[PDB]
Design a protein around this ligand. Sequence first.
Ligand code: CA
Ligand code: CA
Lengths: 223, 223
Amino acid sequence: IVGGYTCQENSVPYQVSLNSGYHFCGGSLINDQWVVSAAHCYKSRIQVRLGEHNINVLEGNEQFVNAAKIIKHPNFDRKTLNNDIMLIKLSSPVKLNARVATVALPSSCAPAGTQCLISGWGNTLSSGVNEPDLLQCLDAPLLPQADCEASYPGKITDNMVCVGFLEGGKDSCQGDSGGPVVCNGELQGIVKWGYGCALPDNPGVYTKVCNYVDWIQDTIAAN
Amino acid sequence: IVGGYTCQENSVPYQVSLNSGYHFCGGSLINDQWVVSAAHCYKSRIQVRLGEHNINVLEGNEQFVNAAKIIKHPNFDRKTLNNDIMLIKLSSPVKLNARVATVALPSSCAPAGTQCLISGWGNTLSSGVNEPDLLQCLDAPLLPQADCEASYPGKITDNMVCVGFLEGGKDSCQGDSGGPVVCNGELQGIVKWGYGCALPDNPGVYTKVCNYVDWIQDTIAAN
Ligand SMILES: [Ca+2]
Ligand SMILES: [Ca+2]
């Protein structure tokens, strides 16, 4: 997260860190046994870490759980990043509590202008790389599709939404990928991509979760 | 490397990739059994990979060798990055050939204005992250100390040199770290740090190797 602020400890309880011996992507806990992330975050073996604040220090709220089933969207297009959504079934249910909680799926697609919260342990610089210890937070609005398309001529599908600021300075970045965009308590986006990070005229692009509730439900039910 | 070009295959034969299950730093082969890198690249277990071109494809020239002894400069200052130099003794001697060769230590410190070659599999973007497959190369001059100091008020010690362009656009970046700066066939610098990558007025800073030949020799001899 570039230009965000340090979240209050355990204030984003649905936030998870995907680990492979190092943090490489975020995700969201949607039920005691399933995590939603980005298909581009796929790895054959993943340890999901919940209840994290300081990614490098054991603080006593952590739950570490291996992924049992990693299911990328059948239509994920690695090239265009269309359908960049993945489901992780954990090897065992987590203990839900105050620091480890679920986020709701969207009842409807959010209108442009709604204020959302984005979080992650992603890169904090607009240039170069800086990995933070503490979870970062960013308040940012969902932009009109026209602004999104305009910024990325020919690349935005209807499964994508832009969130951020046309002025730059504030945005998600590498390492925030697969992480959540929560608006009015519902998961509306997944950190996907953007050109650079926090650059003027290059808002972040996110997977539009409201287009996948059916799929998410079907999959959970079938697995 | 930001704004560089793809090196001709095996044209930088002293270049090595430091691996921990992924490429994280470069280094230089100074003898059939020793590699020079940056102290900030220290890890307790490292696999040194020589003869690489495409970091993700076995091309048939690779030599993979575990580090036996990793020796950080006794005066490395993690805070200022002063004395950012490390020596890696390989578990066994490599087979020197046309794609796996040594680079000479400096006979003297290079004057500002000399043209050097920097190489690596480091990040290729000025904003965001992009890890390349093929080794990247950059031709760039050593800048006058006055320019260096000016760009980084109070941080440059006499063990540091700036290499690059005050205009930006071209530079080393994260992942090129510990890698070589070769001028007229001698190792004159080690990729150390900079503010961002390829930004105007923020040239890359490198460890000045000509200040350590004694140390390098002593250490090799004593180990
Ligand atoms: Ca922790
Ligand atoms: Ca290779």
